[PDB]
PDB file of C-alpha atoms in Angstrom:
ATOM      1  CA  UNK W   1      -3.234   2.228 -81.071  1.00 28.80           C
ATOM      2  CA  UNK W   2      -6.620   2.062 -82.131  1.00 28.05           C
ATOM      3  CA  UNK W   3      -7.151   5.256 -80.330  1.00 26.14           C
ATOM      4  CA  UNK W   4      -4.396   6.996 -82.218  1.00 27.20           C
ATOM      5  CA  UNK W   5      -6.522   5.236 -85.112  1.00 28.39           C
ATOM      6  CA  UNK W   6      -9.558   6.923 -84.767  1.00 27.85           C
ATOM      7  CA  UNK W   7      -7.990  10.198 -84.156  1.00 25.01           C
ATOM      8  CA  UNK W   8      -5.879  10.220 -87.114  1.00 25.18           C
ATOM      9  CA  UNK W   9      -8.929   8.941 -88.905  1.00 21.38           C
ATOM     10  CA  UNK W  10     -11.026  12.047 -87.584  1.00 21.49           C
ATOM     11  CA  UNK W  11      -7.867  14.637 -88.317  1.00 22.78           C
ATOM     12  CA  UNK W  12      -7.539  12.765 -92.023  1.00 23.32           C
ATOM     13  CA  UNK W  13     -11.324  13.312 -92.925  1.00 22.82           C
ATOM     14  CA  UNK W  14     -10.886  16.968 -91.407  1.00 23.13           C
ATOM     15  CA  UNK W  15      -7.672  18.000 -92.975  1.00 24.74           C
ATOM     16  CA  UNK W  16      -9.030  16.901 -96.400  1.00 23.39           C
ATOM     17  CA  UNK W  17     -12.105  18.913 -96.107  1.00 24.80           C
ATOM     18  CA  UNK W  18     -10.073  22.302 -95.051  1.00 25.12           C
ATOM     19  CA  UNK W  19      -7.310  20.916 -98.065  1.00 23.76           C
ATOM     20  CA  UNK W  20      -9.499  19.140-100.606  1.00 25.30           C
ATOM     21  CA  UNK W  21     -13.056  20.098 -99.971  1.00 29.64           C
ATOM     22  CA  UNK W  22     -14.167  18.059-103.544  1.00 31.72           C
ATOM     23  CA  UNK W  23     -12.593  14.993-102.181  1.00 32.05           C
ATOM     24  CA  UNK W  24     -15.024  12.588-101.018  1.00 33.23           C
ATOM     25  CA  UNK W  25     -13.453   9.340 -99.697  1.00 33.37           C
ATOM     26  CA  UNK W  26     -12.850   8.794 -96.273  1.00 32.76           C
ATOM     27  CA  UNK W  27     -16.171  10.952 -95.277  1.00 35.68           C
ATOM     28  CA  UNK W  28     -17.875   8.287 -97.215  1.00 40.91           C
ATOM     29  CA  UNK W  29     -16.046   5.200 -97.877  1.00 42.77           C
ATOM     30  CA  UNK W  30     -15.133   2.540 -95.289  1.00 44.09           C
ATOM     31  CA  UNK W  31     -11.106   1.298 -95.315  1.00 43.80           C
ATOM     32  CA  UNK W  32      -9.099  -1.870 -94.353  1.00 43.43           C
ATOM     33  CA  UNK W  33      -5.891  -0.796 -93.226  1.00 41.78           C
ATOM     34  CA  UNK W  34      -3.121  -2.504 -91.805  1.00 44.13           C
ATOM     35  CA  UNK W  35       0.309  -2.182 -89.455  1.00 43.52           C
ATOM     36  CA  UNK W  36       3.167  -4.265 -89.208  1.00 42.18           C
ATOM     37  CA  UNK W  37       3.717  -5.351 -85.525  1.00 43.38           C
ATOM     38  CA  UNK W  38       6.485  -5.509 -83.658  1.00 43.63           C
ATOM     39  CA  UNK W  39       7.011  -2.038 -81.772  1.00 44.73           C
ATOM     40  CA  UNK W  40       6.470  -2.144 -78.267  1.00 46.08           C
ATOM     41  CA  UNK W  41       3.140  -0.192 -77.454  1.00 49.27           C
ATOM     42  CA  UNK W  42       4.071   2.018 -75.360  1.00 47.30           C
ATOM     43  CA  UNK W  43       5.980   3.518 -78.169  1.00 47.55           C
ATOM     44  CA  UNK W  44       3.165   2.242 -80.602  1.00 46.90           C
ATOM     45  CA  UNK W  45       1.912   5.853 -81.212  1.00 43.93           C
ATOM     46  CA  UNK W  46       5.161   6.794 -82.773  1.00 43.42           C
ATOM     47  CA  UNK W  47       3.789   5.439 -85.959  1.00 42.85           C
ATOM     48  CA  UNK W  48       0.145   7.747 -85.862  1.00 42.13           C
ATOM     49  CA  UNK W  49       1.957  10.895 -87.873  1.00 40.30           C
ATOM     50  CA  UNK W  50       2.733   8.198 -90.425  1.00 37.30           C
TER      51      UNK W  50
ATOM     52  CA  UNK T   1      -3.697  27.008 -63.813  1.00 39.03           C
ATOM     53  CA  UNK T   2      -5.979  26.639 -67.437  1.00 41.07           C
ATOM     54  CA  UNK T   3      -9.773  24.931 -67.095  1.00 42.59           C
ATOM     55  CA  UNK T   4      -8.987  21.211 -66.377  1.00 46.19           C
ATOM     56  CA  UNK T   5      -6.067  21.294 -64.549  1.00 49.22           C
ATOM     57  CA  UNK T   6      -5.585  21.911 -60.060  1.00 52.38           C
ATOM     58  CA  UNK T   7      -2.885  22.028 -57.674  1.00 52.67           C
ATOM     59  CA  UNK T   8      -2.924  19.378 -54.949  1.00 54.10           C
ATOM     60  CA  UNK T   9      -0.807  18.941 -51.813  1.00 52.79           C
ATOM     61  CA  UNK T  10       1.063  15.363 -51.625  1.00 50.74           C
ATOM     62  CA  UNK T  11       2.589  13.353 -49.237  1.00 47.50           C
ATOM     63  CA  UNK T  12       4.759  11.524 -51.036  1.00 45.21           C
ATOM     64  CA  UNK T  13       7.087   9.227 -48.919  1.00 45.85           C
ATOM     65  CA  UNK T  14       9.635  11.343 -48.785  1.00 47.65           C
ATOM     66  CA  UNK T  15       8.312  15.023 -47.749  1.00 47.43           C
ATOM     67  CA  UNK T  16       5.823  16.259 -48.862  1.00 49.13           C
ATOM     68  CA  UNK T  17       5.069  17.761 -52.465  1.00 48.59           C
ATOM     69  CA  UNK T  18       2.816  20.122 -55.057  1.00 46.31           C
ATOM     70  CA  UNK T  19       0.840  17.965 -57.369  1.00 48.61           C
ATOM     71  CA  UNK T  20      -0.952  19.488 -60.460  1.00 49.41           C
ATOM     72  CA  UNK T  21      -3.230  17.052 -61.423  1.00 51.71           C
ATOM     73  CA  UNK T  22      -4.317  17.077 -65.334  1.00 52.80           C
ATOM     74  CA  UNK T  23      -7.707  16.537 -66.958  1.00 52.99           C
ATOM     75  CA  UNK T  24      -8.352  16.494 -70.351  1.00 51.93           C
ATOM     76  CA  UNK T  25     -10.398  14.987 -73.414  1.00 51.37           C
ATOM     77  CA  UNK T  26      -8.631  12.211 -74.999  1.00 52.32           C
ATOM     78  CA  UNK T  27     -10.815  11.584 -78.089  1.00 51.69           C
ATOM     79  CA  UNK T  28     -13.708  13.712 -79.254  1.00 52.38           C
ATOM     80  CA  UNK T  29     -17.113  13.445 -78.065  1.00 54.08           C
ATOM     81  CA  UNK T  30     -18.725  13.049 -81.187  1.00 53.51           C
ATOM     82  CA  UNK T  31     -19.116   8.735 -81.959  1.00 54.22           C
ATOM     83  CA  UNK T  32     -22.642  10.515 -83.268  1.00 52.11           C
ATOM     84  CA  UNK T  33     -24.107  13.767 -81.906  1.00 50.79           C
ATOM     85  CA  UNK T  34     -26.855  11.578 -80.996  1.00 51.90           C
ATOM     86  CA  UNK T  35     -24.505   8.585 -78.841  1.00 52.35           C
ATOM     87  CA  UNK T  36     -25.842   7.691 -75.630  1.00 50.63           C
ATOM     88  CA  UNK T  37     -22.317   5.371 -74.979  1.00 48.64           C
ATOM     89  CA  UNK T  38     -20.716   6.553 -71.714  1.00 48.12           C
ATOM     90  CA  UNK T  39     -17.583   8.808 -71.511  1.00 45.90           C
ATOM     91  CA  UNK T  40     -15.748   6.389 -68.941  1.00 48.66           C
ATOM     92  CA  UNK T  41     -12.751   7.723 -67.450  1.00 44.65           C
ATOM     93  CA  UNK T  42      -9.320   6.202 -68.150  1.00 44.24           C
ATOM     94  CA  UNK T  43      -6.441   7.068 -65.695  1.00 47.42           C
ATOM     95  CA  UNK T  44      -2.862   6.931 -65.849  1.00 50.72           C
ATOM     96  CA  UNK T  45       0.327   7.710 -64.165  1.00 50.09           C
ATOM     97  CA  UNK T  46       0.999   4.046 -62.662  1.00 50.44           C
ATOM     98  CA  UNK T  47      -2.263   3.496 -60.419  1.00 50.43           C
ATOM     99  CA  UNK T  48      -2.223   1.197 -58.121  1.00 50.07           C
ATOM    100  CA  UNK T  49      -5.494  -0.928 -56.336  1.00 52.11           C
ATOM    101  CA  UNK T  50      -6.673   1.466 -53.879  1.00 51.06           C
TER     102      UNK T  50
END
């Protein structure tokens, strides 16, 4: 999960430069997030699109 | 056959068999252009000890 993390992390802060270039937040601003538990990990990635 | 991927000869307990082994990046390089942490490897498809 964490790896599916970091990647949508790196695709977010991508995607909003080629979308939003002005935008300026997850380049430069750090972010709690949080996800509920219960799936079983090996389906865990299910919820990265999201 | 694209860059990353090669055939290999099996003998799987029944017969033998064609393997194509696959190689790939999971997660980009870049930590920080300048990152000495190592790449280390992380296999799957049900390994065993040995």
């Amino acid at each position: 999960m964490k790896e599916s993390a970091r990647i949508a992390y790196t695709f977010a802060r991508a995607f909003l430069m080629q979308h939003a270039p002005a935008n300026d937040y997850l380049v430069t601003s750090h972010i709690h997030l949080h996800v509920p538990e219960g799936a079983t990990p090996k389906d865990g990635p299910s919820a990265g699109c999201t | 056959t694209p860059p990353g991927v090669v055939m290999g000869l099996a003998w799987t307990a029944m017969g033998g068999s064609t393997l194509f082994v696959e190689t790939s990046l999971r997660r980009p390089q870049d930590k920080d252009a300048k990152g000495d942490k190592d790449g280390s490897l992380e296999v799957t498809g049900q390994l065993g000890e040995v």
